Amino acid sequence: EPKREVCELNPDCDELADHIGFQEAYRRFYG
């Protein structure tokens, strides 16, 4: 899961993913 891989390595993205999941967090961070 490249989305989670990338997002997990950004504390802000990971924090967002804690709330909305990696796909939404990735989209909001890397869209």
Closest among 29, 27, 26 to 4, alpha carbons compared: 26
Q: Method of determination? A: X-ray
Which amino acid appears at position 28 of this protein?
R
Question: Entry resolution in angstroms?
Answer: 1.4
Q: Which residues are annotated as a binding site for Ca(2+)?
A: 1, 5, 8, 14
Closest CA to 4 of 28, 23, 30: 23
What is the Cα gyration radius of the chain? 7
Residues that constitute the known binding site: 1, 5, 8, 14
Tokens describing residue 14: 């990971």
Report angle CA 7, 12, 15 to the nearest 5 degrees. Answer: 85
